[PDB]
C-alpha cells in the first residue's frame, strides 16, 4: 500500500525546517480526530482503515543515506524500518504490519520488542546516557542503513521524532540542538514525560474538554530528580507542551 510521507534531510537542515517537519508529521496522523482541550486524540484501532494506519517517515543522513520508518497512526509508535532493500520488524510485529509494509523488500524479524526498557536492555545502555542531536541522528541513520547497532540507534530516532511530535518541550530541546550543532543527553524531566504519556492521556481525557483539574495526579521528575506531581492541565501543558493525546478514555 502507498502511505503518505514526511521527510527530513539533515544536509543543510535548519531548526526551522525541522519544526516544519514535526508539523507535517502531526497533521498526517491527527487526521479524522475529535480533540480535547485543543489536543487531538489518535484514532482508536477500531476506526482506522488499514489504508491509513501507517505513515512513512523518510530521514536522510548527511551522506545521502535514507532510512524509512513506519509509524502507527493510532499510537504514534515506530513499528518498523527499512533501508537498502531490507526491512525490519520487532518480535511482536502483528501480521498487519508485515502484510502491508515495505512490500518488495527483504523483511526481517528482530530479536527484541519496541519497549523503552526492551530497547534499553537490547542496546546495552539506558536512554539517560545516550546522546541526541544533529550528529547522533546522522550517525544513527548510517548505523541502521548498515544494519548494525540497530537497538541503540532506534532510541535516538524514537526520541528525536515520535517523542518530539508528542512533546513540544522535546521539540524545543532538539530544535536548539540543530540551531547550534551540539549534543545532549535526556534529563530527568524529559524521560519523565516520555514514560507517562499514557497517564497524561488518561488524566486529560477523564476530566473532559475544558475541565482544568485532574482527578488524579501525574508523576514527573525535576532536573534534580526530585518527584513532582502535576494535577491540572495548564500545569501539565506549560511543563511538557504536549501536542498529541493517546486514546485511553472516551469521556
Amino acid at each position: 500500500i502507498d502511505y503518505p510521507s514526511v521527510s527530513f534531510n539533515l544536509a543543510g537542515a535548519k531548526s526551522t525546517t525541522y519544526r516544519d517537519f514535526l508539523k507535517n508529521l502531526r497533521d498526517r496522523v491527527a487526521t479524522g480526530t475529535y480533540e480535547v482541550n485543543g489536543l487531538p486524540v489518535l484514532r482508536r484501532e477500531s476506526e482506522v482503515q488499514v489504508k491509513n494506519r501507517f505513515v512513512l517517515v523518510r530521514l536522510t543522513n548527511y551522506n545521502g543515506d535514507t532510512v524509512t520508518s513506519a509509524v502507527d497512526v493510532t499510537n504514534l509508535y515506530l513499528v518498523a524500518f527499512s533501508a537498502n532493500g531490507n526491512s525490519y520488524f520487532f518480535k511482536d510485529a502483528t501480521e498487519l504490519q508485515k502484510s502491508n509494509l515495505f512490500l518488495g523488500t527483504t523483511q526481517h524479524t528482530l530479536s527484541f520488542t519496541g519497549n523503552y526498557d526492551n530497547l534499553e536492555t537490547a542496546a546495552g545502555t539506558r536512554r539517560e546516557s545516550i546522546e541526541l542531536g544533529p550528529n547522533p541522528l546522522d550517525g544513527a541513520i548510517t548505523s541502521l542503513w548498515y544494519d548494525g547497532g540497530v537497538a541503540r540507534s532506534l532510541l535516538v530516532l524514537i526520541q528525536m521524532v515520535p517523542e518530539a511530535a508528542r512533546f513540544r518541550y522535546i521539540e524545543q530541546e532538539v530544535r536548539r540542538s540543530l540551531q547550534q550543532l551540539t549534543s545532549f543527553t535526556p534529563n530527568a524531566l524529559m524521560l519523565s514525560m516520555e514514560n507517562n504519556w499514557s497517564s497524561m492521556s488518561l488524566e486529560v481525557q477523564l476530566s473532559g474538554d475544558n475541565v482544568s483539574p485532574f482527578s488524579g495526579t501525574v508523576q514527573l521528575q525535576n532536573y534534580d530528580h526530585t518527584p513532582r506531581l502535576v494535577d491540572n492541565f495548564e500545569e501539565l501543558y506549560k511543563i511538557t507542551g504536549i501536542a498529541i493525546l493517546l486514546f485511553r478514555c472516551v469521556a
Binding site: 513540544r168 475544558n210 482527578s215 513532582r228 478514555c249
Partner: protein, 264 residues
C-alpha cells in the same frame, strides 16, 4: 470506553497574587464568608471537588450568597443551599464560573482577608484562578519566534526579544496561578498590554489584576489576552530588540511560544 467516574479529590485554590482561598477563621458554621489568605496546610484551606459540580470544605458546600454581580461567596449546608449557588465550573483559561448566573469568582484585591465575590466575567486577572496542590508559580523561559527569548529590560517596563541566555535573570518569568506573568525576581511586575487593539504594544506594568494583564497559554502554542482574544505577536520588521504586540491570531511562527521550564 466511557470515562470512568472519578472519586472526590482534594486540592486548594490559588488565585490573585498567589493567595489561597480559605474559609474565614476556619469556622465551619453556615454562612461563613470565603476569603484570600497565604497558602498553608490549614484544613479549612482544602477543598474537595465532587462530581455534583460542588466544591466543599469541612463538609459545607461553596455557595454564592446571591446570584448577581457583587454577591459574596461563603460556605453552608449543601442539603439546604440553593441548587445553583452551589454549582461551579473550573475552566482551563483559569475561570471558575457559576453555570446558572454566568458570573465568575472574583478577587477585588490581592490583600489577604479579601472576601471573594461573584461578578460579571470581564476576564480580569482578578478572576484568574488555578486549583492544585502545588501552590507555587512555575518559573520558566519564554522562548519564541526566532529561537530568541522574551526579555524584560531596563527599568522593567519593556519587553524585547533577544538571544536566549538561561542564566540571564531578565529572561526568567514566573507563571503565576492567577493567570498573570511576572518577573521572577520582581513578582510585583506583570507582563501587560497597552490596550485591546491590534498592534497595541506590550510592556511591564504593576500587577493590579487588570484585563490587560490576564494571559492564557492556549494549547495551540499561542498566548491569548482573554478579553481581546488577541495574541502575543513579535514585530518581524525589527532587526534587533524586536518588540512584542497583541495581534489577531494568524498561525504564523512569530505567534508561537514555548514555555521552557528552567526549574519547574
Amino acid at each position: 470506553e466511557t470515562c470512568a467516574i472519578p472519586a472526590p479529590f482534594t486540592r486548594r485554590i490559588v488565585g490573585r497574587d498567589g493567595l489561597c482561598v480559605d474559609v474565614r477563621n476556619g469556622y465551619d458554621t453556615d454562612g461563613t464568608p470565603i476569603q484570600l489568605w497565604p497558602c498553608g496546610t490549614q484544613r479549612n484551606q482544602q477543598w474537595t471537588f465532587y462530581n455534583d459540580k460542588t466544591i466543599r470544605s469541612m463538609g459545607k458546600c461553596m455557595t454564592a450568597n446571591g446570584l448577581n454581580s457583587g454577591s459574596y461567596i461563603m460556605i453552608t449546608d449543601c442539603s439546604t443551599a440553593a441548587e445553583d449557588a452551589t454549582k461551579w465550573e473550573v475552566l482551563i483559561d483559569g475561570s471558575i464560573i457559576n453555570p446558572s448566573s454566568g458570573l465568575v469568582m472574583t478577587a477585588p484585591s490581592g490583600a489577604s482577608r479579601t472576601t471573594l465575590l461573584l461578578e460579571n466575567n470581564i476576564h480580569a486577572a482578578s478572576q484568574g484562578w488555578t486549583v492544585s496542590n502545588d501552590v507555587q508559580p512555575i518559573a520558566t523561559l519564554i522562548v519564541g519566534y526566532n529561537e530568541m527569548c522574551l526579555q524584560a529590560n531596563g527599568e522593567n517596563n519593556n519587553v524585547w526579544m533577544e538571544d536566549c541566555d538561561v542564566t540571564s535573570v531578565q529572561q526568567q518569568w514566573a507563571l503565576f496561578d492567577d493567570r498573570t506573568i511576572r518577573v521572577n525576581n520582581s513578582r510585583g511586575l506583570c507582563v501587560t498590554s497597552n490596550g485591546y487593539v491590534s498592534k497595541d504594544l506590550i510592556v511591564i506594568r504593576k500587577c493590579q489584576g487588570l484585563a490587560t494583564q490576564r494571559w492564557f497559554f492556549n494549547s495551540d502554542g499561542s498566548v491569548v489576552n482573554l478579553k481581546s482574544t488577541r495574541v502575543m505577536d513579535v514585530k518581524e520588521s525589527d532587526v534587533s530588540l524586536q518588540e512584542v504586540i497583541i495581534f489577531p491570531a494568524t498561525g504564523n511562527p512569530n505567534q508561537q511560544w514555548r514555555t521552557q521550564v528552567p526549574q519547574i
